Amino acid sequence: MDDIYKAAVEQLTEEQKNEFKAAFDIFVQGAEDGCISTKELGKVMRMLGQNPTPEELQEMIDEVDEGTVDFDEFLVMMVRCMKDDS
Ligand SMILES: [Ca+2]
């Protein structure tokens, strides 16, 4: 895994990582596919209680993308968004 991504992922509990993977898995044909689309990214995040805005999703795709989001990118984006709660 990318070392910076570890900055983010180390913030997650094991319970969180498992919950987040189960949510991500809803949005892929797991037998064939490892990424969700950029529209689905907002959906999985919202499934986990986050509410990213449309500008934010594009920014996150610009900054964290290594169109498509794999599981570790998704985790980093979750961590980012988790930190904008008020
Ligand atoms: Ca839990």
Swiss-Prot record:
<protein>
    <recommendedName>
        <fullName>Troponin C, slow skeletal and cardiac muscles</fullName>
    </recommendedName>
</protein>
<dbReference type="GO" id="GO:0060048">
    <property type="term" value="P:cardiac muscle contraction"/>
</dbReference>
<keyword id="KW-0514">Muscle protein</keyword>
<feature type="domain" description="EF-hand 2">
    <location>
        <begin position="52"/>
        <end position="84"/>
    </location>
</feature>
<feature type="modified residue" description="N-acetylmethionine">
    <location>
        <position position="1"/>
    </location>
</feature>
<dbReference type="GO" id="GO:0005509">
    <property type="term" value="F:calcium ion binding"/>
</dbReference>
<dbReference type="GO" id="GO:0006937">
    <property type="term" value="P:regulation of muscle contraction"/>
</dbReference>
<dbReference type="GO" id="GO:0031013">
    <property type="term" value="F:troponin I binding"/>
</dbReference>
<comment type="function">
    <text>Troponin is the central regulatory protein of striated muscle contraction. Tn consists of three components: Tn-I which is the inhibitor of actomyosin ATPase, Tn-T which contains the binding site for tropomyosin and Tn-C. The binding of calcium to Tn-C abolishes the inhibitory action of Tn on actin filaments.</text>
</comment>
<feature type="domain" description="EF-hand 1">
    <location>
        <begin position="16"/>
        <end position="51"/>
    </location>
</feature>
<dbReference type="GO" id="GO:0031014">
    <property type="term" value="F:troponin T binding"/>
</dbReference>
<keyword id="KW-0007">Acetylation</keyword>
<dbReference type="GO" id="GO:0003009">
    <property type="term" value="P:skeletal muscle contraction"/>
</dbReference>
<dbReference type="GO" id="GO:0002086">
    <property type="term" value="P:diaphragm contraction"/>
</dbReference>
<dbReference type="GO" id="GO:1990584">
    <property type="term" value="C:cardiac Troponin complex"/>
</dbReference>
<dbReference type="GO" id="GO:0005861">
    <property type="term" value="C:troponin complex"/>
</dbReference>
<dbReference type="GO" id="GO:0055010">
    <property type="term" value="P:ventricular cardiac muscle tissue morphogenesis"/>
</dbReference>
<dbReference type="GO" id="GO:0042803">
    <property type="term" value="F:protein homodimerization activity"/>
</dbReference>
<dbReference type="GO" id="GO:0032972">
    <property type="term" value="P:regulation of muscle filament sliding speed"/>
</dbReference>
<feature type="binding site">
    <location>
        <position position="73"/>
    </location>
    <ligand>
        <name>Ca(2+) 1</name>
    </ligand>
</feature>
<comment type="similarity">
    <text>Belongs to the troponin C family.</text>
</comment>
<dbReference type="GO" id="GO:0051015">
    <property type="term" value="F:actin filament binding"/>
</dbReference>
<feature type="binding site">
    <location>
        <position position="65"/>
    </location>
    <ligand>
        <name>Ca(2+) 1</name>
    </ligand>
</feature>
<feature type="binding site">
    <location>
        <position position="68"/>
    </location>
    <ligand>
        <name>Ca(2+) 1</name>
    </ligand>
</feature>
<dbReference type="GO" id="GO:0005829">
    <property type="term" value="C:cytosol"/>
</dbReference>
<dbReference type="GO" id="GO:0030049">
    <property type="term" value="P:muscle filament sliding"/>
</dbReference>
<keyword id="KW-0225">Disease variant</keyword>
<keyword id="KW-0597">Phosphoprotein</keyword>
<keyword id="KW-0106">Calcium</keyword>
<dbReference type="GO" id="GO:0010038">
    <property type="term" value="P:response to metal ion"/>
</dbReference>
<keyword id="KW-0479">Metal-binding</keyword>
<keyword id="KW-0677">Repeat</keyword>
<dbReference type="GO" id="GO:0030017">
    <property type="term" value="C:sarcomere"/>
</dbReference>
<dbReference type="GO" id="GO:0048306">
    <property type="term" value="F:calcium-dependent protein binding"/>
</dbReference>
<keyword id="KW-0122">Cardiomyopathy</keyword>
<dbReference type="GO" id="GO:0043462">
    <property type="term" value="P:regulation of ATP-dependent activity"/>
</dbReference>
<dbReference type="GO" id="GO:0014883">
    <property type="term" value="P:transition between fast and slow fiber"/>
</dbReference>
